[PDB]
Amino acid sequence: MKSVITTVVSAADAAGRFPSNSDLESIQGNIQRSAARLEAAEKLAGNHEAVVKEAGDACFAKYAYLKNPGEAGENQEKINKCYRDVDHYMRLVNYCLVVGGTGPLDEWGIAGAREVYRTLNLPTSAYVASIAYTRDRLCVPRDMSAQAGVEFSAYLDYLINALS
Amino acid sequence: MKSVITTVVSAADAAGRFPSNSDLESIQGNIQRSAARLEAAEKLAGNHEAVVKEAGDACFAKYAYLKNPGEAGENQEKINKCYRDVDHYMRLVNYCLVVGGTGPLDEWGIAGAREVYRTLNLPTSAYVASIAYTRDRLCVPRDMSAQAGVEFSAYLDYLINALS
Amino acid sequence: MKSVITTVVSAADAAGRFPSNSDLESIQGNIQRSAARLEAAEKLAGNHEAVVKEAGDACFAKYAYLKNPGEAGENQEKINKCYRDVDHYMRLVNYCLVVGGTGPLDEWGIAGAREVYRTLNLPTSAYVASIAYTRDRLCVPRDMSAQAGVEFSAYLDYLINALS
Amino acid sequence: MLDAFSRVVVNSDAKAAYVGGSDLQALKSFIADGNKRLDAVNSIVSNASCMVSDAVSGMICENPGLISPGGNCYTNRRMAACLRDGEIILRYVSYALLAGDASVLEDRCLNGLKETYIALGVPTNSSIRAVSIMKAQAVAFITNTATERKMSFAAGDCTSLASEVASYFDRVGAAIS
Amino acid sequence: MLDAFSRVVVNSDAKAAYVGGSDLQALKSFIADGNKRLDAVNSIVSNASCMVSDAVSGMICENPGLISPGGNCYTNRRMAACLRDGEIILRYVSYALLAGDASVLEDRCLNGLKETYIALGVPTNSSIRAVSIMKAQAVAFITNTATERKMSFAAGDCTSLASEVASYFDRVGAAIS
Amino acid sequence: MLDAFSRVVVNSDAKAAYVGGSDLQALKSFIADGNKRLDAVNSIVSNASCMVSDAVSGMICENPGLISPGGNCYTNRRMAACLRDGEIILRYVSYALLAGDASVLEDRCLNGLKETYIALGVPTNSSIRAVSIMKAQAVAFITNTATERKMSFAAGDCTSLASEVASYFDRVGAAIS
Amino acid sequence: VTGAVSSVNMRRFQRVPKVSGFSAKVTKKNVNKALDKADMFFAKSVTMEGKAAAIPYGVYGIQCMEGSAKGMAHEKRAMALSAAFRMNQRSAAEKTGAMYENRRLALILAQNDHQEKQYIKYPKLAAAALMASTEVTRACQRYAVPESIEEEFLAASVDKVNKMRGTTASGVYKSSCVEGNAKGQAEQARVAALAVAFRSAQKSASQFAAERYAQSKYGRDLFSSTHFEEGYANTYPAMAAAKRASSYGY
Amino acid sequence: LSSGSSAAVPFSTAVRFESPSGGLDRYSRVDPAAPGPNVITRFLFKDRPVRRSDPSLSEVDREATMRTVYRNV
Amino acid sequence: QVGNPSTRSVSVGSLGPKVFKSEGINSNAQKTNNESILQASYLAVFGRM
């Protein structure tokens, strides 16, 4: 839950200090940038079944080796468990677009994922090819605002970098 | 360099003790198993260019996305670096059969491998698709002796349990 | 309790590893060397009423100044407790041959004994003459086998160097 | 820790008995069948990565409310800690099968495991099923009856070591029950 | 630390070679020597409490300036530390003879021992004598030519093992020179 | 500096003893093999220009990054200073073979060679392979087993001089690393 | 204008290293200063990764607070910098004795031969990895709380004999265990240590349960060599965390 | 250390003259593996000069050093 | 040898018996054939074992 709020409050709690004018000046940027990220949050919250259907079959159009026997996506009950996770990651993008900071992506979807995907033999390049499909399916005047699409694709790039 | 000697010396060095009879009893067990693994070590050194040719493409025949553009092995430079890596792992199994411990694999082939194949986007189930072809092509009474298989197939499975 | 099984597992626990091929090779020395230290275990089990009495007066042959009043050993229950000590010390060597290690002499016989023998005003040189009598009264092909006498007289002079 | 040799010594110490021939022949057949024990615990460690993945994904396959929002294995932070705990348990059974005694499992691991898990809210019924899957995995690797992998062994019968590792997975299964 | 088998694979790694059958019988000679090497490191650790009493009491009668007022081994605190460091030095030679390599002697003990003794003020002329007294005590106890005590070995020739342990004892003297 | 004769004198001076007949016969064996020692220094010095070019062009043959731009043996100014440095290492080893003691090599060549290559950026992994090729060239020239240059000697064993000169090449390699 | 040439003491830095004699004495001094402040970069970089475990997602945890009042953080600076001044006032029996005490403990701690090579060469890297291993897994004595009243008596008996190694052999105090060096400076550390005792009880449910299993590992592969000492470490983890190393005399 | 010292004074001199010359047998710092001169001269028919290379400086080389001091210096 | 006395110690090669040499030709240079030379010198003197 690394916000702009929880960063400057917990850093002021380590010195044992009152909130000073450097702390309040950081929250003034939260009343400047929140119009773009809450626009992109409500655009994702009303269109999410359309975009995780479009993302997940770009993974299996590229990586068609997964539908082989003995591989990962070999029966129907675990292809449905794959789109479960693309819906899980877009929900965490929508949470961190609300709080304005990478915390919901960090401690609920990333912090332990490399231990899990290796042990269950899940290819993390298939997760990248879904998340980096929606970053360049987006076109900035049609789908959201100009600065709403800046901060939306910037939270996808955190998800591409933490898996790659 | 974990072996039979380097375990029992450093266990006595941390304790601050002389070598007693429990320390010399372990080196006696290094004498009896030495005929089986050094038979497997000399079998691997005189055959390795036919093993990693059959093993280099054990995975390449298994997985094939690598030869699409943008993948891991898309040109002959990157294919030759894949056979470079099966030959590096078959050389490190050969050093582990000599020392009698996982020490050569633990420090030159495993430590850092998860943090390298990730950031260079290398599919870690294509290495294990070549090590497990080597472990299954080994018939026992033609290639080596009975307990030369149980040392050679156990160091292959230490590489499989540490990669994936 | 230092032994040959409880130091290769206790060093594999400190690194968080499984028991590897290095760890099973140390246990097979307790298959080959076990038939001699368990061969000297029955011989000490069937002679300890004799050899304790044989080592008890070997102290009193060297030190006849024990039994005088003004000096220490002036009565009977100070004398019969000396055979109580050296029957314990023969029992811990009989424990040491069974475990395949110097475990039971360490924590029960050796540990703390330099404070007990000092503060009770016992001469510590009287103990080591009784132990070193049985290192010399042993002749090797008559009593036990060849490699049982090198195991039995490896814990006796371990006790001698730990005493003084 | 203690082992099978040290258990006989600390038993016989309380009677002040010398270790004689009344109880050395139990230890003699421990060593004489000792090449099957190293043939047993090699077969567990050679499959120990797949024996946690077949375990805790079959535990969720029989109790699918563990990955529900609120469950114990919901986030990636929590599914990784159950996969971590699924291979600390298999490691100390491997330390107990090799030593032939369950004192390395009892004191270093199971002392305070039940009083840990009730301060964290781990479900103490589905955790038994991940253990009891692994008991069925191990005894098909001891007796070479796993249906996907066949390891090459010598001929003979080793049913007493499949029943000892089955006795070790119940000391952990009764520790948190 | 290294041993004999790990020394010959860090040299084959440097030229990227497999350890084939050309330098394997250099290692097969180490295994057939193994019962003589194990028979002989038992000889030093059985007598090691007397080998440090025979060494540092020989040094104080050859050089009686160590028990002079203000010396190195003058007071009762300093005599116990010289009696400690004689057994630390003999302990790391015993690890080197058992391993078959001087790697554990050189770094864990000898690396930094020279400027330790420079900063402490140990006279380094006396320490060469007290480590060469123990070198003579080692090769008397290896090859069974000790006058007051004889040990029961099998018959054979082990002058290569006695000259290998003398190679580690003057490696101590070259480092602190 | 010292040689093999005055090494025995300084060991005897520390005990204030006359060197007598009990250890003169290990100096009479130095004299009786003294023709073969000179016979062997002549076989190294006759081939020493070809030994430092088969070495440092085999160091380039196994590590092509030295002749890459920015490398250590890149330009002509730098390759001539590596080829100079090969025949000061070979020159000081043959002073120590001819003396039978390495103390001219340790006091005039390996005294601060490590701290000079650190301040110059000379890669120490490649300056072991230059020395360890030259060790294998010397032992092939002592024992008369070089393939492209056969010489003519009288019959008799000289592997005790090839093993002494191999251990002088393991002190060049164990002082710069 | 003056005729001001470059000095003889300034042109000598442009000289190439030679290999023997007095010209090897200059290069031996210049490399041993360049290995000394490379060793400081080794100890600084390890502490900057052990401090990244108390910032586990980007926000400052309760482990890395300084003091709670106004001037309770500036005086935590002003007695750490005088703690390091009294560190290099010890004699040669304490500086070299702690170098070998740290080198025994750092090689149990190491996981590969590259790590255990560098703890031998660099002394301050090994001293700042014994402390950095304990501040991550919270196996210290400022982090362990006793969960009984026999456990508080067991840890006070271990901490009774650690307080005598901060005294000398005749029995007087060292300068190793010093609280205050100025007027009223002892009571500011009394305030700052009661504050960090309160935050140790404010940990999470799993943060208390991970450091139960971490203090038992720390007391049984660094300070136990028998089986009875393993019984005092596998059942009472607060006496297994008061077992400090013998480098600092606390 | 006592008498046998220096004067440091970097400036010392004071004059803006035209520069005189040097030798040619100097340390060059470019190609320091070169013979240069003193391979075809009357350097070959003198005795070779003594540079200290030993830390110990044995007592018959101590007397041989100071004979070169009285002859040359 | 009756017209070339200098050919003693010259290996005849493939037509004579195999010669023996305690050489020790290795980069650490130690003889690896201490076993076989002892096995071969027993046969030079006694002709058998």
Ligand SMILES: C=CC1=C(C)[C@@H](Cc2[nH]c(/C=C3N=C(/C=C4\NC(=O)[C@H](C)[C@H]4CC)C(C)=C\3CCC(=O)O)c(CCC(=O)O)c2C)NC1=O
């Ligand atoms: C809180 C956030 C959160 C996440 C980020 C994910 C993370 C996550 N993914 C999986 C689990 C999975 N993820 C997949 C997905 C795939 N494998 C395939 O076969 C396809 C190629 C690919 C689709 C991209 C599969 C199959 C599993 C189950 C593991 C298995 O069946 O072995 C599991 C195991 C439990 C399960 O079955 O759901 C967890 C915790 N789940 C979460 O709860």
Ligand SMILES: C=CC1=C(C)[C@@H](Cc2[nH]c(/C=C3N=C(/C=C4\NC(=O)[C@H](C)[C@H]4CC)C(C)=C\3CCC(=O)O)c(CCC(=O)O)c2C)NC1=O
């Ligand atoms: C909240 C997240 C969110 C998104 C990222 C987009 C993703 C998205 N794009 C399209 C659908 C489309 N998207 C484009 C857009 C483009 N094609 C181009 O050549 C240009 C580069 C780019 C912007 C002009 C076009 C032309 C279509 C219709 C044809 C098609 O489906 O490809 C659709 C299907 C119907 C629709 O909604 O339009 C969806 C779900 N929509 C969302 O709701």
Ligand SMILES: C=CC1=C(C)[C@@H](Cc2[nH]c(/C=C3N=C(/C=C4\NC(=O)[C@H](C)[C@H]4CC)C(C)=C\3CCC(=O)O)c(CCC(=O)O)c2C)NC1=O
């Ligand atoms: C001594 C230990 C040791 C190893 C274990 C390997 C590990 C390793 N592999 C690569 C590097 C590589 N490894 C591969 C390998 C593969 N690609 C495929 O198609 C398959 C997945 C696989 C063969 C089975 C490829 C293609 C590269 C080059 C990646 C790149 O483009 O950077 C690199 C980067 C340096 C290089 O290019 O060689 C390293 C360190 N190398 C070592 O030196």
Ligand SMILES: C=CC1=C(C)[C@@H](Cc2[nH]c(/C=C3N=C(/C=C4\NC(=O)[C@H](C)[C@H]4CC)C(C)=C\3CCC(=O)O)c(CCC(=O)O)c2C)NC1=O
């Ligand atoms: C030496 C012995 C030893 C052990 C036995 C373990 C025991 C153990 N497990 C957990 C910790 C945990 N254990 C679980 C486990 C589960 N939840 C489930 O659904 C399953 C039933 C089960 C996995 C099989 C989870 C989910 C956590 C993390 C709690 C959380 O963060 O939500 C913790 C707290 C530390 C942490 O945060 O990880 C400890 C001490 N650790 C040890 O050191």
Ligand SMILES: C=CC1=C(C)[C@@H](Cc2[nH]c(/C=C3N=C(/C=C4\NC(=O)[C@H](C)[C@H]4CC)C(C)=C\3CCC(=O)O)c(CCC(=O)O)c2C)NC1=O
């Ligand atoms: C979601 C549905 C789903 C499941 C219900 C489980 C399926 C499953 N498999 C096993 C059972 C097993 N799992 C293994 C483990 C392995 N077998 C091998 O050959 C490999 C080497 C290794 C890991 C890949 C073994 C050895 C058994 C024992 C049975 C057998 O092999 O015949 C068990 C235990 C039986 C019991 O409860 O007693 C279960 C429940 N997995 C799933 O995905």
Ligand SMILES: C=CC1=C(C)[C@@H](Cc2[nH]c(/C=C3N=C(/C=C4\NC(=O)[C@H](C)[C@H]4CC)C(C)=C\3CCC(=O)O)c(CCC(=O)O)c2C)NC1=O
């Ligand atoms: C240090 C490494 C090391 C090992 C890994 C083992 C390897 C090993 N296992 C066996 C030998 C054997 N192993 C088995 C075991 C089995 N056979 C079966 O049919 C069961 C499926 C399976 C149980 C796991 C049997 C039955 C024998 C032969 C009988 C016996 O040894 O008592 C033997 C032969 C022993 C002999 O010939 O006396 C060896 C060397 N030993 C070692 O020294």
Ligand SMILES: C=CC1=C(C)[C@@H](Cc2[nH]c(/C=C3N=C(/C=C4\NC(=O)[C@H](C)[C@H]4CC)C(C)=C\3CCC(=O)O)c(CCC(=O)O)c2C)NC1=O
């Ligand atoms: C001031 C007078 C005085 C001395 C001169 C010394 C006596 C002394 N003894 C030894 C030499 C020795 N000391 C021992 C030690 C022992 N012998 C045994 O059999 C016992 C088990 C053990 C001592 C209890 C051995 C084995 C030798 C080697 C020579 C020998 O005795 O055969 C040496 C080494 C010889 C050398 O310099 O190389 C010296 C100097 N001690 C003194 O107080």
Ligand SMILES: C=CC1=C(C)[C@@H](Cc2[nH]c(/C=C3N=C(/C=C4\NC(=O)[C@H](C)[C@H]4CC)C(C)=C\3CCC(=O)O)c(CCC(=O)O)c2C)NC1=O
């Ligand atoms: C692992 C490697 C390792 C070592 C080698 C030793 C090294 C060592 N020795 C001493 C310390 C000492 N060493 C000596 C020894 C001697 N004086 C002499 O001239 C004799 C030659 C020699 C006796 C044989 C003395 C007398 C002291 C104590 C100095 C004093 O307080 O007077 C100290 C100082 C700390 C202390 O007091 O113990 C250290 C670190 N310790 C180690 O941990």
Ligand SMILES: C=CC1=C(C)[C@@H](Cc2[nH]c(/C=C3N=C(/C=C4\NC(=O)[C@H](C)[C@H]4CC)C(C)=C\3CCC(=O)O)c(CCC(=O)O)c2C)NC1=O
């Ligand atoms: C736990 C403690 C422990 C030991 C002490 C050794 C004990 C030991 N020493 C030797 C065995 C032997 N030891 C020697 C050694 C010697 N003969 C000499 O003349 C020299 C004086 C001396 C060494 C310096 C020889 C020559 C043999 C027989 C050769 C051989 O075993 O191959 C043997 C082989 C038995 C035999 O083959 O007869 C054993 C088990 N092993 C152990 O596990």
Ligand SMILES: C=CC1=C(C)[C@@H](Cc2[nH]c(/C=C3N=C(/C=C4\NC(=O)[C@H](C)[C@H]4CC)C(C)=C\3CCC(=O)O)c(CCC(=O)O)c2C)NC1=O
């Ligand atoms: C008495 C002993 C003695 C020596 C051993 C040499 C040591 C030595 N070498 C160099 C100097 C050098 N040494 C090297 C050498 C190498 N780079 C490599 O890759 C190879 C590993 C290695 C050659 C085999 C190079 C390349 C330089 C020149 C540095 C440069 O200008 O780039 C210098 C600096 C001064 C000078 O160049 O003259 C010195 C003192 N000189 C001595 O007086």
Ligand SMILES: C=CC1=C(C)[C@@H](Cc2[nH]c(/C=C3N=C(/C=C4\NC(=O)[C@H](C)[C@H]4CC)C(C)=C\3CCC(=O)O)c(CCC(=O)O)c2C)NC1=O
């Ligand atoms: C293109 C790549 C390239 C190489 C890889 C090296 C090839 C090479 N040659 C030698 C090895 C050698 N080089 C010589 C030198 C000579 N032999 C003679 O008879 C002449 C007198 C003299 C050269 C004119 C000798 C004597 C050996 C020893 C082996 C032998 O000749 O039997 C070694 C040492 C083996 C080792 O690593 O230990 C190597 C790597 N040179 C190269 O150019």
Ligand SMILES: C=CC1=C(C)[C@@H](Cc2[nH]c(/C=C3N=C(/C=C4\NC(=O)[C@H](C)[C@H]4CC)C(C)=C\3CCC(=O)O)c(CCC(=O)O)c2C)NC1=O
């Ligand atoms: C001024 C320069 C000068 C020399 C170079 C040597 C030259 C030399 N070498 C040998 C003589 C010999 N040289 C060898 C040497 C060898 N045989 C081998 O198999 C090895 C390959 C090789 C040396 C490494 C042997 C074995 C003898 C005869 C044994 C002896 O030394 O008497 C002899 C004969 C001595 C005699 O008459 O008995 C001479 C003169 N002497 C000198 O005065």
Ligand SMILES: C=CC1=C(C)[C@@H](Cc2[nH]c(/C=C3N=C(/C=C4\NC(=O)[C@H](C)[C@H]4CC)C(C)=C\3CCC(=O)O)c(CCC(=O)O)c2C)NC1=O
């Ligand atoms: C790399 C990770 C790392 C951290 C997370 C921080 C942790 C940390 N340590 C100290 C501060 C300190 N930490 C210690 C350390 C210890 N005390 C003991 O009893 C044991 C010997 C040892 C436990 C490891 C000491 C002695 C101080 C000085 C203040 C004090 O005495 O408490 C402080 C400042 C004081 C305060 O908390 O108010 C902080 C933030 N430092 C780090 O370096």
Ligand SMILES: CCC1=C(C)[C@@H](CC2=N/C(=C\c3[nH]c(C[C@@H]4NC(=O)C(C)=C4CC)c(C)c3CCC(=O)O)C(CCC(=O)O)=C2C)NC1=O
């Ligand atoms: C070497 C002797 C020494 C110390 C001890 C500290 C002590 C210290 N910490 C401070 C202040 C301070 N301390 C921390 C926590 C701390 N900071 C970090 O970067 C990390 C990883 C931390 C441990 C978790 C924070 C977050 C601040 C506030 C500084 C800021 O972020 O603005 C302040 C300033 C207080 C103030 O200005 O009011 C001091 C004096 N400084 C020293 O010079």
